[PDB]
Design a protein around this ligand. Sequence first.
Ligand code: S3P
Length: 427
Amino acid sequence: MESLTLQPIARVDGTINLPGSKSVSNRALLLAALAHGKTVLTNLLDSDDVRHMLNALTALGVSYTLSADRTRCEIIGNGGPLHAEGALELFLGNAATAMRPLAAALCLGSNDIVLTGEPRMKERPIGHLVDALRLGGAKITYLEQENYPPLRLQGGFTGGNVDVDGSVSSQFLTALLMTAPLAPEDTVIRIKGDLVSKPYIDITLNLMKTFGVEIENQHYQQFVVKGGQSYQSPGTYLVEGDASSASYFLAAAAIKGGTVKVTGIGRNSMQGDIRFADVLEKMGATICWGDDYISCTRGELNAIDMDMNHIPDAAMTIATAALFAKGTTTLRNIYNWRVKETDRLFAMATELRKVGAEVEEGHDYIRITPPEKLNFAEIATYNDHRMAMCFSLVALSDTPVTILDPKCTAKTFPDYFEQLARISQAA
Ligand SMILES: O=C(O)C1=C[C@@H](OP(=O)(O)O)[C@@H](O)[C@H](O)C1
């Protein structure tokens, strides 16, 4: 078991040029692959999740080249639905942004492809998406547990009236939205009830528009899609810096700055996680917005009690920042933390208690009361990049912290520790 021990960080200050957005990167790659023309993506993220998407595109026969640092990608669009037969297996690691979108996309036309991934991926739900694709005509088989990957896709999605559950993940609808335009018949996607992680739907629609396709969004309750469309290369496309990866650095400044500036995202960014900055401001930090940067300057840090459904990923960072806040912090409406890289409500509560906090692990919320002083702990990371990055912040105290399996950060941010070190100052 590899581990990394972080020594106490006296102050953080500086500028970080963010790695590309995982959410935007994987959507842009798939749309570029489906599109007509050559797409040049810059600031593409180089991380495990994007690598699994690139590998899947290579296996499907898509041609592309990558720059030395793997952040510039020139993709030759296929000019239509991707295809493979012979039950070709695409191994998708634990990349949900590859698994859900490809599960839908590869149902266009005929195909015989199997999607699988790491053990935990076989425990992350995909039934709501399968249900919706089958209502549209797709033939899909669960090869192991019903409602979970791995899946055997045999095609057949033609469009039509389809309902989709949006209560557990926004990714199922995202996958349907990206796929439906290329289906021969028009599609009307009806959301059954609640829709969580709504901002990710805006990211999907923004990317689809960039690639030449628009749809009729009726109050996020129903989506009208015209069939028979084609995606078109936007030419050169700049991938936004990752606003979720930014949360750690902005929070570090709120706790121990100094001023930390992250570049690559700004006030016009499409990522819902830029709203994480609003939360730090509510806690007492000072925030500055620019066209291509967001900065946070230490002020004070007071506990908050907020519904975090709009920023589920970045919200985890508030769970550890809460260790440094005055009062008890409560994060609500985050049930789906349970069905992500790990059950994040169980994991976060378990590890927070190890450094001294009193924590109530609610079914769909978490309440954190910080200790007078933190103590040393060896933090388990549950093969979850965000558990490692969140707990790195424990070192902004008087105690060191040991993070197990630090390389798990590579899922979305391979250079995380070197970047945190860049802004760490001894004086
Ligand atoms: O579409 C996306 O890029 C994502 C949507 C979110 O998932 P849910 O919709 O399941 O909350 C988020 O947690 C995940 O890391 C990325």
